[PDB]
Structures are given as structure tokens and as C-alpha cells.
């Protein structure tokens, strides 16, 4: 689309450029409209990529999220982990809203949605840290006092990766994922 | 493929053993936020009734507005009458609140004059009317009227939205009483003490 | 200077001794009407929770949809799993409903084919899935699939809105169960009988 | 406005033409947007008129509504009667909506809003009759079976007169009505 | 990656040796179509000037409206005056046209009464005023006024848009004359014969 | 409307308060939407006022505009003067636009619309001065270099008075003005 | 998207179903908004398909359009043929507009855009025939008198195929087409 | 009851003996302003043709863009071809301009890289392509590409709108040439010198 007019050519790395450009395109679309839904076809460059997990998820520790939460059958762990990711995706999008939630600056561990979704997976809390919720309280997790606003680029990057990971996990539950062994790439 | 988990609901602390209260407070913020998005936002009965029908104490429902005093001290004659007198005041007080949230505030938003004819006949017709203006930010009292502090450039959006919501809720309550359709059989008595 | 008295609330009969039920039914119509105004209308948790949190019997909450059967007969393994399996089906069933309310219906709206890959893996994955399609109007069964009667030019808007609302409510319920935030501690058990 | 370009001249009846034209203008504005609010200045030709009550309210039996419900002080009767009129105005506007209420065809006497507002005044039920709710049941009042739609001109006329009467009653409670003895014109 | 080739421009026949005329006629249809899309559409000077600045004969520019007669027969006194008198009439005649294109026509759109005070003082103040109404469809003459044929359910959209456009163009012309900014030095004379 | 909730009461000056409040209301409506049209009924408090010309036009020297340009019959002078006012009203409204004309800072005497409309009346140039075009060049008239923006309240006040004066002059041409001798009030 | 919920499964023909479903999806999107632009990623199922030309273009005689107009180098013929297709695409879209061009019923051979674009390629006229312009005049080509409206499904099918063919021809000029020898598939 | 007198037309100096030029310049500003209001604004043939059909010299029509050089220096082979090659470049150059007017600029708007694949194949395919980027503000040349000055926080809206308009006009011209519908019989030759 647009970002493609500005990203540097990458001779001999055409598949990686295509990835990097798409990522940036969708990051910008989230910043323009945080409530926006993306189609499978819009995500395709990011889903079909042969690139390794370490290079597709730059912020999000996807390896530790799946490996540390593969309890029982894939059908079990997968449902739990995508319920957490769904909630996490909302935390990210909400931070890019033109009118953020009044109490956007803090998440509380005792919060009823949080306690049973995000906090049901190891690595969940870390993801909020990636959004900017970097300060520890006994009560929960918060943005630094002096930070007046979210880093919208950081938020969009993480939000995109969260939604991407969830999408991947959904196509596996469907038995519909492009990469033939995408679970084995994530689990080992 | 999304979970049903609200929006403000994600940030408000848990309140174990107080789930109806928490649900009320979260619904309350969403309506306050909606007024901040659009100062002219109208709310339907179905959006307000779940807030009004909760069994909570009055002190739990009305955090800024002193609803007890507004009802009790103006309970002159029959409810058929003073509820209308009060509704009229509350109605005008809501406009004062919404106007402060408007993208283009009234030129003269900084002050309210006691000899203003609408104010005189509606809001100043009831005890507590001035206090509500105070809650919006009209805290500096001249003999001429009430005004915002000279130094303060803007109203406090959150505070104003809050007070405006509560003004609106209570007027809804009085209005349901007038229609004998308030969901709580004892709603008036609770307001009188 | 208006009274707070709803809209559909003005036409529904009184129900003395059944005020919570009546309030639920009125809130239910408004959401159904909203889907008819806009087939893509999203509803917030605060709009749906007051419908879900009522103590009413299941037969009082679900007038068209057979929610008991949908939950009970597909309760295979652990709720963590079959609630997701059911949610996935309900989600797709909601799209079928909304699509029938769309100002431009899918070209092929008149029929659903059993070998359709989305249908096969989602809706046909659960008992009761076909019955729901039947409720939308897909009442004529070929061996190929289900379809609307040849003679019938349009879907029944009210019926479709109704069923789509209920499909949506139940999926909200399952979703609140998955999040351990359903307002009723016994909500699952009620659905299982 | 617009209707003024079409209404016939009325030599020697300039004040009555002005009334008739305004009425029609506002009737049309209700038909275009049934949820629309009118300002005191928009209603002025209809409020300031010296014309007699019989000629300002053509459908609405305003005389019988005020005279039959003047219980106690004006402050009392006036509040009750304007609460009824407020509800009646909603019944009218709702019938001119682009998506009418599902059960628009019938009003039920046991309806909780109806029972304590409209049915609190003698003449209340008649007003619904003027909207088209002409068929009697023990249960309530209904549009004839064969009538597929409201008469939008009849509905707008009555809706306007209802709102006009209520507005008048409001300016008296305010002690703000243009005609010096508008209550005496209505009560005798 | 699209070619710049207009829209109505794709359907109008070629006119070799008459390219400026054809371009005028195509621009004319687009503005007529725009009035049909939105009866309140305002047009800027830049949209109208290219139509007015063409060297075409008057009979080539005004296909329905008899602009010659409107200017010539009402040329009483000085242009400073009668151009205003004419503009006032044309202005009202444009409202009559636009109103017939409105999604909700004036209740009384079917007839115009000669004793109507606006009509009397504006449109009936000039020769040709009635003829223009005739062009819109008010073809049946009573002694009371002019009206559409009883049988005819709707105005002719295309005809009305056409006439309304021309009424508008000419009033633009008179207005440019009043401002000494008409692009043609001889524009008045052309209208007088 | 809204401004009425804030303007001070004026015991014994009810007709002047009504004027002052309406003026302010319409000034604000111009600032919200500079392209907005006003109805005769919206202008009525400002047209029907018995208040003297000196108190109805506070910025605009209406006396000098009409008296100095009454050439020939009223029909003549009136048409010329309302053509000037129409153009002047555009200069005012344009300054309250959310995207002002690129060259809003300067008006040029040789400008073709200006030369034959505004500059056809004595007092025309002064009106632009009232909008903020206070600096003299041989070429035209300009806003001071250091002034980054129009005084939107000054602009709205003058714009309103311009439109009001033009409206008055239009109702006289119509023989339709509320005050029986409004021309004599303006001309002497 | 939506149409995918209704199209019949096609065991052993997954690549053809994917094509057929996408086609129908985009046909519907054209019918909803005839002025709408499609992205390369939206067209991908239709561009990347290994399916034969005869099965990708069902109405549009793509074979005869390219083979009969390969004059000179590909760079030449390709530019000419995509200029024709661009114009043809407008004729199709215009027929699906909510307010069709006034003279939509007829195309004239002497029309200046037509004469030098569409009529510059053999097969051009046939494409209009596919839109419904089936009746021959010496003057041009027209819809049958009795046909009150376009067949919006026929129009959308042809419009889509036109835009698809043009898109293909554009990616060849770019040297960017997915199929390695897409010109050889079209030319022989 | 308004006069037809434009908007930008009220501020531009008079130009006696140069009325067609002045009218062109005023129409030009309005389209530039329209791009500033909405960076995605599409313009119809009828809005652009009156600018293109004027007899003015090329130096009078193209104030920023060096249209002569763009056409002349890339006139390789036949117009059927190089006009397409040029149109493709101009098309991409217009996106670069509009993107700088967007309410949310591309994250990487500050720089254009010469090895960028779209740039390489389209804009860098023609002499003058880089100069146009320079006109938008990409004035600092690295070996990597072109970029805005580090210090400059925003593009120059007016300049960018101007250049983008001209890029658009010329591409319209080339497009009319390709369709043999340019209003001036000699339009190509004028561009070649």
C-alpha cells in the first residue's frame, strides 16, 4: 500500500521485505482506526511467510507463550491461550483509541476479566509490559507517572503481533493453517 | 471472533462480594465517557434503568451529587409537584454540564449570574442548586454570581461528565417516580432518608 | 423537556408481578429493533449484561432458540473446550442471521449447503446447529442442504432479528462463563438442566 | 419557509394565513424527522397568535383537556396534564419514524407508562384515537386491521397540536406565556 | 490507475466541429445530475463559469428556458435595477424547481396559487415567470393558479433538473453582470437580442 | 438558547437583554458554522426591536452606509448597497472558516469582485477594517503582520451586523419590514 | 467472506472453489459500491490461480482480446489494450451506480472517448454487448427498449473480468505477474 | 439570496488584460485548497478540463512543475508508449504528494530510498522524477535517497498541494492525449517546445 512507497529495497531478501512492509502497513492501519477488523487476506503476507518465528515476532515472546502453556491436548491449551490473546488485543487497541479508557494508565491483577484470561497464561503479564505497563505495584501494573501518552508505534507493533499470534492459533484449531507444521515451529 | 468483556470494565479494580456495585460503577463510567465523546448524547431508558434498579445505597450510587439533600430539602407539598420543580432544575443543571463538555463552549461559560432569569426561576428555585454548579467548577463566589477560577483555562472534563451523569440519573429517577414506573417500590423513601 | 419512558416500552402490555421479566422482554425488543436498523450493529457488554443477569427461567429468556439443547447435548469433555466449540458455532450462526438482515443479502442467501466447509466444521459440529438455521427460515430440506421456500421472496425480519439476538445472547453467556465473569454463579447449571 | 411558496394568499386574513402556513411547515418537519426538537422561536407564530382556541386546535379538543383536568391549583393540574401530553407526543412521533416500534399498531390500557400518564387525564384516550388508534378492545386500543400504515398527515397534525398545547402549558408554569390570560382562554 | 474521461461524457454523441458546444452540454448534464442526486446542492463559481464563458449562441446554451424573453421583456429602467428584479424572480423560481427534486416534496407541491404573496411579489413581477413554472410541470391552468395534471403522480426529474439548472445559470449570469465580472464583455447585449 | 443561560439579568431592560442575548447566540452559531444560513424567524429579535439604530449596530456604522449611498430612488441605492453587503458578508464568514482562503490576510482594491461591489459604496472599505484588515497599502488592505489569526468574536459581531443590515434592506425592497418607518430611522 | 458461507463444498476441487467464491465476493462488492477500488491482495485468489484462461474468464473472451491486438512489442499492444479495458471498466461500473448516467441505455460509436479507446481494439464492442448493449444501430449500440434495468449480476461479472484482465496486463508491464509465463497463456 | 463570486476569487489581485489567466489561477487555488481539505479528493474531468483547455503559455500553467522537461526528455519512441511511461510516474508522484497531505502520514514519510522497488520502476524510470520529489520537500540528498531536512517538523501544505495539483493536471493532459480528447489540437507540441 502506502508504506511500500518508502521502505528501502532489500535485494536478495524479497520475502523479508514483504513481511516487514506488511507489518508496518497494518501497524499504521491500527493507529488510524484501533477498532478495525483485518481479513485473512490482509494478514496473508504475515501468515504465509516461511520466515522463522524469531523474525516474525520481534517484541512478543511467542515461543514462551505457547511452550509454557501447552497443557493437555492442543485443543485445550490453544483455547485457553487464544482467550488470553483476545483480551490482550483489547488492551492494545484501547490504548490507540482517540478517547482512551479513563483508567488506561493501570491494570489491576484482581480485575475480573484479567484474573481469569490474561493471568491464566504464563507470559500474559509480560505482554502488558510490552505495551508500556512497566511499573510494578502490589495491586497491578502501570505506565510510568511522567509518561503522558502511549508510544503508539510500540503499542501497534505489539497489538499486531498479539492478533497475529491469535490468528495463527485459530487456524490450527480449524486445521486450516498455511504452514503444514506451524505448531511444531512454535512448540520446538 | 471477540470476547464480551466491556471496555472500562477492563481497568476498574475487582470488588469481590460487591459485584453489583462494581457493575454499576463500570456502567456509570461508560455513560460518563459517552458524554465526553459527545456532549449532546441522549440516553435511552434501557441504558439508564440498570443503573437505577440496583439495590445499592444512595451513597453508593451518587458519588459527587448530594441527591438526598436535593430531594429532601425541596419536598414541599406533594411529590406530584415538587418532583416536577426539582426535575425542571435538574434539567437546566444538565444543560450547564453538557455545555461545559461542548466542542464550542458558550462564550460566557466561565460564570453564572444569580439574576439570570432562567437560573433564578429554575435552579435557584431549589436548595442545592448552587452546590451543583460548584461541582461543575463554578467555585469562586462573587456577589454577582459564581465563576470558574481566573487561572483555570478549561473545565475538568471527567468531573463535569460525572456530575452531569448523576444529575441526569436523578432526574430520570424523579421522572420514573412521576410515571409510577420506578423499578424500586421504595425509591422515593430512600431519597428522603 | 422529555420523560424517560423508553420506546418499545410504550407498546408492550403490562405484566403485574412480573416486572423484571417485562423489563427483560422490552430490552430484548430494543436490541432486536437495533439489528433491524443496522445488521452490523455491535453491542457492548453493558447493553447485554442486564439481559443476562436477570434471575428469569431459561424458558423465559430464550423464546425461539433452544439454548438448553445447544449447551446440554454438546457438553463433551470440559467446559473450557465445548464452550469454545459451541461459541464458534454460535458465532457463525449469528453471521447467517445478520446476513439475512443486510441491505444487500449475499447472492446465495436462499440456501445453505451441508458440504460447505465453514458450515461443516463449525455449525454442523454441534447438535442443534441445523435447527437454528431452520428458525431463520431455512425450513425446506433437500439432501444437498437447507433452503428457504421457493415462493417466499424475503426473510421474516422480526423472526430473524429475534433468533439472531438470542444466538448472540447465548454466545455472550458462554463467553462470560469462559472468563469466569458471568453475573450468575449458577449460569452453566441452569443451561444443563 | 417552503410551504409558504404554495399556500394561497388570504386577503384580509393575514394573521390566520401566517398561522396556517407555520402549522403546515412544522407538520412537514415532523414528517421529515420525527425525533426533531423545535425552538420557542420556531413555535412563535403558533404561540403568539390572537386567533381563538377553536381555530388554533383543529383536531385536539384542547378545551376539554384543560377544563376537565383542572384539579386543585393550576400548578397541580398543569404538571399532571403536561406529563400526559409529553407521553402522547411520543406516541405521535413514533408513528412517523422510518422504523416504527414493532407493536405500533396497538396501545394497551394496562401499559405501565400509559396507565399513570395518559390515562391519568380525561380526554387522554381520545388523543390516541386521533392518531388512528380507533378500534376498541377490552385490552386497549388499535389501528384497523386493514390499515397498512399511519396517515402521516393526520399524525403530524395531532402531534404538532399536542406539543403546542404542552408548550403553552409549560410557559404558564413559567409565568412566561405571550398571551396575558392564556389560561382563561383555555379554561373558559 | 484510471483515465480522465468524465462520466456523462461517455454517453453523449460526438459532435465534430462543435467541440466547445459538446463540452458545454456534457458539463450541463453533470450539474443537472448533481441536482438530482441532491436537491440542495450548491454550485461554486468555478463549476458554473466554464458554462457561462463559452462563446455559444444563446439558443445553444438555453435549451428549455427562454432567457432572451426573461431579460428583454423585463428590461425596465437601468440594468442595476431590473437585473435585481429579475434575479429575485429567478431565485424564487429555482426554489420551486429544487423543491420538486426534494426527497420530501412540500405537501402542496402540486399547485401554485397566483394570490400567493411570495409568487405575487417576485415571480409574477416579471413576464415569463409563469412560463417557467409551466416548464417544471405546472401546465394545467385554473383561474386560481397553475397545477400539475391530476393524473401525473410525480414530477419529471430530468426536465425539472434541466430547467432548474438553466434558471440557476441565468441568475448566475445576471449576478456576474451586477458585479461587472461576467467573462464575456457582450453578455447583456446577447440576452437583449 | 445556550448563551441565555449565562447572560446577566437586566431588570427594567427586558427588550435590550433579549436583543443582546440573541446577538450573542447568532454570533456563536456563525463561529460554529460560518457557512450557515439564518431564517427570518431566527433574526426576528434583532429585526423587530424598537431599540435605536445606534444601539442595534455597535460596530457597523449603519447610519453612514445608508445616508452616504442613497443615490436616486430607494430602489436604486438599496440594490447597490445590498450587493456590497452581500460581498462583505462573505469576507466575514470566510474568516471564520475551519480552512480559511489561502490569501485571507489581504484584500486588494483592484480585485474584480471588490472593485464593483464593496468599493461601489462609501464606507465599504471601513467594514473590512472592522474585520481586522487594518493596515494600509497602496495595493489594498491587510491584517497586521504579527497577528496570526482573526479575532473570531470581532469577526462574528461585524459579520452578524452586516447580514442584519442587508436583511433589513431586503425587507424594505419587499415592502415587508416590521418597523413601519425603518428607512427613516436609517436615513435621518 | 460472506458468500463463502453459502457456496457448496467442492471435494477434490479446492483451488476452483476458492476462485469461484472470490469472484462472487468481488462481484457483490461491486454491486454494493460500484465506485470501489480493489487491492492487489483482494484480487490475489483470482490472479494467482493456476486455473486455465478458459475457466478464469467465463464471459470475457480474453483470448481474442489479447491475441487479436498484439501489435508490435508487448509494451505497445499492452498499453493500448489496457487503455481500452480501463474505459470498458467504467461503462460497467456506471451501470451499477445508484444513479446511472442519464444516457446509460446507449453507447455511440462516434463518442470521442469510445472512438479512440474501446474502438481501438478488436473485441471492444463485444464487451459492451456482454454488459447488455445488445441492439445494433448504425449510430451505436443499445439496451433493448423493453429492458427497464441492467442485469446487475451480468454487469458485475463482466466488470470484474474486465478489471481482472487489465490488472493482469498491468503486472506484465511491471514485470511483476505471479504466473511466470502469463502472456504465453493469453497469447497461445 | 447570495451573489455568485467564488471564494479564493475574492483575495487574488485583479489582472486587467489577463482575465483568462486570472480565472485559471483562481480555479487552480480552489483545487489546491480542496486537496488540503481532503488528501484523497478525486477530481472529475469537468473540474480539470477548464484549466487544461485555456490557451495560456505552459510557463503560465505550470508554476512549480517543469512539465516541459518531463515530457520532452522522456519522449522516447512513440507517444502511445512514453505517455504511458510518464503517466505511470506521474501517478506515483501524485501519491507521494497526497500522502504528505494525509491526516496520518505514512510512518516513513520523511525519506524516499532510491532502491525502493516502486520508485525504481516508476518514478526513477523518467528524468525529472527526482526533481518533483524535491519540490515536495525531499531536498536533502543522501547516497541512500532523498529526505526532508532533519529540523523541519511538517511538510509545507501549500507547496505540496500546488505541486500535487500540477502533477495531477499534467497526467490528466497526458491521459487526454492518449484518448485523442485533449481540447487543444496542439497540446503535445506545446509540451515538447
mmCIF file of N, CA, C and O in Angstrom, chain E residues 143-176:
data_model
loop_
_atom_site.group_PDB
_atom_site.id
_atom_site.type_symbol
_atom_site.label_atom_id
_atom_site.label_comp_id
_atom_site.label_asym_id
_atom_site.label_seq_id
_atom_site.Cartn_x
_atom_site.Cartn_y
_atom_site.Cartn_z
ATOM 1 N N UNK E 143 -58.296 29.308 -12.852
ATOM 2 C CA UNK E 143 -58.288 30.752 -12.566
ATOM 3 C C UNK E 143 -57.590 31.061 -11.248
ATOM 4 O O UNK E 143 -57.109 32.174 -11.048
ATOM 5 N N UNK E 144 -57.551 30.051 -10.383
ATOM 6 C CA UNK E 144 -56.935 30.083 -9.064
ATOM 7 C C UNK E 144 -55.399 30.101 -9.148
ATOM 8 O O UNK E 144 -54.707 30.629 -8.255
ATOM 9 N N UNK E 145 -54.871 29.508 -10.219
ATOM 10 C CA UNK E 145 -53.431 29.286 -10.346
ATOM 11 C C UNK E 145 -53.060 28.220 -11.368
ATOM 12 O O UNK E 145 -53.835 27.901 -12.267
ATOM 13 N N UNK E 146 -51.861 27.672 -11.218
ATOM 14 C CA UNK E 146 -51.351 26.637 -12.108
ATOM 15 C C UNK E 146 -51.154 25.365 -11.307
ATOM 16 O O UNK E 146 -50.866 25.432 -10.127
ATOM 17 N N UNK E 147 -51.327 24.210 -11.940
ATOM 18 C CA UNK E 147 -51.125 22.955 -11.254
ATOM 19 C C UNK E 147 -50.685 21.840 -12.191
ATOM 20 O O UNK E 147 -50.828 21.926 -13.417
ATOM 21 N N UNK E 148 -50.084 20.815 -11.597
ATOM 22 C CA UNK E 148 -49.756 19.595 -12.315
ATOM 23 C C UNK E 148 -51.040 18.900 -12.754
ATOM 24 O O UNK E 148 -52.061 19.054 -12.087
ATOM 25 N N UNK E 149 -50.998 18.142 -13.872
ATOM 26 C CA UNK E 149 -52.145 17.293 -14.230
ATOM 27 C C UNK E 149 -52.512 16.330 -13.090
ATOM 28 O O UNK E 149 -51.612 15.724 -12.477
ATOM 29 N N UNK E 150 -53.810 16.221 -12.804
ATOM 30 C CA UNK E 150 -54.347 15.327 -11.758
ATOM 31 C C UNK E 150 -53.743 13.926 -11.818
ATOM 32 O O UNK E 150 -53.345 13.363 -10.787
ATOM 33 N N UNK E 151 -53.666 13.379 -13.031
ATOM 34 C CA UNK E 151 -53.190 12.007 -13.241
ATOM 35 C C UNK E 151 -51.717 11.750 -12.950
ATOM 36 O O UNK E 151 -51.338 10.633 -12.577
ATOM 37 N N UNK E 152 -50.889 12.781 -13.124
ATOM 38 C CA UNK E 152 -49.439 12.654 -13.033
ATOM 39 C C UNK E 152 -49.000 12.560 -11.576
ATOM 40 O O UNK E 152 -49.146 13.515 -10.828
ATOM 41 N N UNK E 153 -48.451 11.411 -11.188
ATOM 42 C CA UNK E 153 -48.062 11.144 -9.791
ATOM 43 C C UNK E 153 -46.796 11.877 -9.320
ATOM 44 O O UNK E 153 -46.711 12.257 -8.155
ATOM 45 N N UNK E 154 -45.814 12.039 -10.208
ATOM 46 C CA UNK E 154 -44.516 12.630 -9.866
ATOM 47 C C UNK E 154 -44.072 13.659 -10.886
ATOM 48 O O UNK E 154 -44.455 13.582 -12.043
ATOM 49 N N UNK E 155 -43.210 14.599 -10.483
ATOM 50 C CA UNK E 155 -42.599 15.472 -11.473
ATOM 51 C C UNK E 155 -41.662 14.702 -12.376
ATOM 52 O O UNK E 155 -41.238 13.619 -12.021
ATOM 53 N N UNK E 156 -41.346 15.260 -13.538
ATOM 54 C CA UNK E 156 -40.325 14.690 -14.409
ATOM 55 C C UNK E 156 -38.960 15.206 -13.933
ATOM 56 O O UNK E 156 -38.552 16.303 -14.288
ATOM 57 N N UNK E 157 -38.304 14.406 -13.083
ATOM 58 C CA UNK E 157 -36.944 14.638 -12.562
ATOM 59 C C UNK E 157 -35.955 15.295 -13.563
ATOM 60 O O UNK E 157 -35.327 16.298 -13.252
ATOM 61 N N UNK E 158 -35.805 14.710 -14.752
ATOM 62 C CA UNK E 158 -34.818 15.193 -15.742
ATOM 63 C C UNK E 158 -35.142 16.582 -16.249
ATOM 64 O O UNK E 158 -34.279 17.449 -16.258
ATOM 65 N N UNK E 159 -36.383 16.755 -16.678
ATOM 66 C CA UNK E 159 -36.942 18.043 -17.057
ATOM 67 C C UNK E 159 -36.811 19.105 -15.973
ATOM 68 O O UNK E 159 -36.431 20.236 -16.235
ATOM 69 N N UNK E 160 -37.169 18.748 -14.755
ATOM 70 C CA UNK E 160 -37.116 19.694 -13.666
ATOM 71 C C UNK E 160 -35.654 20.101 -13.396
ATOM 72 O O UNK E 160 -35.359 21.289 -13.230
ATOM 73 N N UNK E 161 -34.760 19.110 -13.346
ATOM 74 C CA UNK E 161 -33.311 19.359 -13.125
ATOM 75 C C UNK E 161 -32.721 20.293 -14.168
ATOM 76 O O UNK E 161 -32.010 21.224 -13.838
ATOM 77 N N UNK E 162 -33.042 20.007 -15.421
ATOM 78 C CA UNK E 162 -32.720 20.822 -16.594
ATOM 79 C C UNK E 162 -33.129 22.295 -16.430
ATOM 80 O O UNK E 162 -32.295 23.208 -16.483
ATOM 81 N N UNK E 163 -34.430 22.509 -16.232
ATOM 82 C CA UNK E 163 -34.971 23.850 -16.089
ATOM 83 C C UNK E 163 -34.365 24.534 -14.868
ATOM 84 O O UNK E 163 -33.999 25.693 -14.931
ATOM 85 N N UNK E 164 -34.226 23.808 -13.766
ATOM 86 C CA UNK E 164 -33.674 24.394 -12.553
ATOM 87 C C UNK E 164 -32.225 24.818 -12.787
ATOM 88 O O UNK E 164 -31.809 25.892 -12.372
ATOM 89 N N UNK E 165 -31.458 23.971 -13.455
ATOM 90 C CA UNK E 165 -30.076 24.327 -13.818
ATOM 91 C C UNK E 165 -30.059 25.631 -14.620
ATOM 92 O O UNK E 165 -29.362 26.580 -14.260
ATOM 93 N N UNK E 166 -30.861 25.690 -15.678
ATOM 94 C CA UNK E 166 -30.871 26.869 -16.537
ATOM 95 C C UNK E 166 -31.288 28.114 -15.775
ATOM 96 O O UNK E 166 -30.646 29.170 -15.893
ATOM 97 N N UNK E 167 -32.316 27.993 -14.945
ATOM 98 C CA UNK E 167 -32.735 29.125 -14.100
ATOM 99 C C UNK E 167 -31.539 29.599 -13.292
ATOM 100 O O UNK E 167 -31.237 30.784 -13.223
ATOM 101 N N UNK E 168 -30.880 28.650 -12.662
ATOM 102 C CA UNK E 168 -29.661 28.927 -11.909
ATOM 103 C C UNK E 168 -28.520 29.554 -12.740
ATOM 104 O O UNK E 168 -27.888 30.525 -12.331
ATOM 105 N N UNK E 169 -28.242 29.006 -13.903
ATOM 106 C CA UNK E 169 -27.211 29.604 -14.762
ATOM 107 C C UNK E 169 -27.493 31.073 -15.066
ATOM 108 O O UNK E 169 -26.596 31.926 -14.994
ATOM 109 N N UNK E 170 -28.738 31.379 -15.398
ATOM 110 C CA UNK E 170 -29.064 32.724 -15.858
ATOM 111 C C UNK E 170 -28.964 33.717 -14.724
ATOM 112 O O UNK E 170 -28.459 34.819 -14.887
ATOM 113 N N UNK E 171 -29.437 33.312 -13.561
ATOM 114 C CA UNK E 171 -29.299 34.128 -12.381
ATOM 115 C C UNK E 171 -27.822 34.357 -12.044
ATOM 116 O O UNK E 171 -27.459 35.417 -11.521
ATOM 117 N N UNK E 172 -26.979 33.344 -12.298
ATOM 118 C CA UNK E 172 -25.533 33.498 -12.130
ATOM 119 C C UNK E 172 -25.067 34.575 -13.096
ATOM 120 O O UNK E 172 -24.411 35.539 -12.695
ATOM 121 N N UNK E 173 -25.453 34.444 -14.362
ATOM 122 C CA UNK E 173 -25.140 35.484 -15.367
ATOM 123 C C UNK E 173 -25.552 36.894 -14.922
ATOM 124 O O UNK E 173 -24.753 37.848 -14.955
ATOM 125 N N UNK E 174 -26.787 37.044 -14.473
ATOM 126 C CA UNK E 174 -27.253 38.374 -14.077
ATOM 127 C C UNK E 174 -26.405 38.867 -12.930
ATOM 128 O O UNK E 174 -26.018 40.035 -12.879
ATOM 129 N N UNK E 175 -26.110 37.960 -12.019
ATOM 130 C CA UNK E 175 -25.277 38.260 -10.861
ATOM 131 C C UNK E 175 -23.863 38.671 -11.263
ATOM 132 O O UNK E 175 -23.326 39.615 -10.710
ATOM 133 N N UNK E 176 -23.259 37.980 -12.222
ATOM 134 C CA UNK E 176 -21.944 38.432 -12.752
ATOM 135 C C UNK E 176 -22.037 39.786 -13.448
ATOM 136 O O UNK E 176 -21.081 40.579 -13.427
#
